[PDB]
Design a protein around this motif. Structure first.
Motif, PDB file in Angstrom:
ATOM      1  N   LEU A  19       0.834  -1.197   0.000  1.00 38.25           N
ATOM      2  CA  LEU A  19       0.000   0.000   0.000  1.00 38.25           C
ATOM      3  C   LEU A  19       0.871   1.251   0.000  1.00 38.25           C
ATOM      4  O   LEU A  19       0.635   2.190  -0.761  1.00 38.25           O
ATOM      5  CB  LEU A  19      -0.907   0.003   1.234  1.00 38.25           C
ATOM      6  N   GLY A  20       1.907   1.239   0.830  1.00 37.48           N
ATOM      7  CA  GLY A  20       2.806   2.383   0.921  1.00 37.48           C
ATOM      8  C   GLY A  20       3.443   2.670  -0.433  1.00 37.48           C
ATOM      9  O   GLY A  20       3.501   3.816  -0.879  1.00 37.48           O
ATOM     10  N   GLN A  21       3.891   1.613  -1.100  1.00 35.61           N
ATOM     11  CA  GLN A  21       4.559   1.767  -2.388  1.00 35.61           C
ATOM     12  C   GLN A  21       3.635   2.451  -3.391  1.00 35.61           C
ATOM     13  O   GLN A  21       4.053   3.340  -4.135  1.00 35.61           O
ATOM     14  CB  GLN A  21       4.984   0.397  -2.919  1.00 35.61           C
ATOM     15  N   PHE A  22       2.367   2.053  -3.388  1.00 37.92           N
ATOM     16  CA  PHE A  22       1.394   2.642  -4.303  1.00 37.92           C
ATOM     17  C   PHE A  22       1.279   4.143  -4.066  1.00 37.92           C
ATOM     18  O   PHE A  22       1.246   4.933  -5.010  1.00 37.92           O
ATOM     19  CB  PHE A  22       0.023   1.989  -4.125  1.00 37.92           C
ATOM     20  N   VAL A  23       1.249   4.539  -2.798  1.00 36.25           N
ATOM     21  CA  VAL A  23       1.132   5.953  -2.453  1.00 36.25           C
ATOM     22  C   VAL A  23       2.296   6.736  -3.062  1.00 36.25           C
ATOM     23  O   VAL A  23       2.108   7.821  -3.613  1.00 36.25           O
ATOM     24  CB  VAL A  23       1.113   6.119  -0.927  1.00 36.25           C
ATOM     25  N   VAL A  24       3.493   6.167  -2.982  1.00 40.36           N
ATOM     26  CA  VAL A  24       4.677   6.829  -3.521  1.00 40.36           C
ATOM     27  C   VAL A  24       4.494   7.081  -5.017  1.00 40.36           C
ATOM     28  O   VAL A  24       4.790   8.166  -5.515  1.00 40.36           O
ATOM     29  CB  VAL A  24       5.920   5.965  -3.275  1.00 40.36           C
ATOM     30  N   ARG A  25       3.985   6.077  -5.725  1.00 41.62           N
ATOM     31  CA  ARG A  25       3.782   6.204  -7.165  1.00 41.62           C
ATOM     32  C   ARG A  25       2.844   7.363  -7.480  1.00 41.62           C
ATOM     33  O   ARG A  25       3.074   8.122  -8.421  1.00 41.62           O
ATOM     34  CB  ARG A  25       3.191   4.914  -7.737  1.00 41.62           C
ATOM     35  N   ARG A  26       1.786   7.492  -6.688  1.00 46.34           N
ATOM     36  CA  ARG A  26       0.801   8.545  -6.912  1.00 46.34           C
ATOM     37  C   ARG A  26       1.441   9.923  -6.784  1.00 46.34           C
ATOM     38  O   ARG A  26       1.169  10.821  -7.581  1.00 46.34           O
ATOM     39  CB  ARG A  26      -0.343   8.417  -5.904  1.00 46.34           C
ATOM     40  N   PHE A  27       2.292  10.082  -5.777  1.00 48.02           N
ATOM     41  CA  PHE A  27       2.976  11.354  -5.566  1.00 48.02           C
ATOM     42  C   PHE A  27       3.800  11.734  -6.792  1.00 48.02           C
ATOM     43  O   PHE A  27       3.718  12.861  -7.280  1.00 48.02           O
ATOM     44  CB  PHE A  27       3.893  11.256  -4.345  1.00 48.02           C
ATOM     45  N   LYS A  29       3.358  10.835  -9.774  1.00 47.21           N
ATOM     46  CA  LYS A  29       2.451  11.150 -10.873  1.00 47.21           C
ATOM     47  C   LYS A  29       1.726  12.465 -10.610  1.00 47.21           C
ATOM     48  O   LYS A  29       1.245  12.710  -9.504  1.00 47.21           O
ATOM     49  CB  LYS A  29       1.429  10.024 -11.043  1.00 47.21           C
TER      50      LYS A  29
END
Length: 30
Positions: A19-27, A29
């Motif tokens: 979940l944390g990794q996904f958040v990083v990707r969003r940032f 983008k």
């Protein structure tokens, strides 16, 4: 933590990490 042996504990760790990794990707983008 209690109940480290049970597989459920392992699943929890995997979930939160992903979940944390996904958040990083969003940032990254915009």
């Amino acid at each position: 933590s209690l109940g480290n042996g049970p597989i459920l504990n392992v699943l929890v760790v995997l979930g939160v990490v992903l979940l944390g990794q996904f958040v990083v990707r969003r940032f990254f983008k915009s």
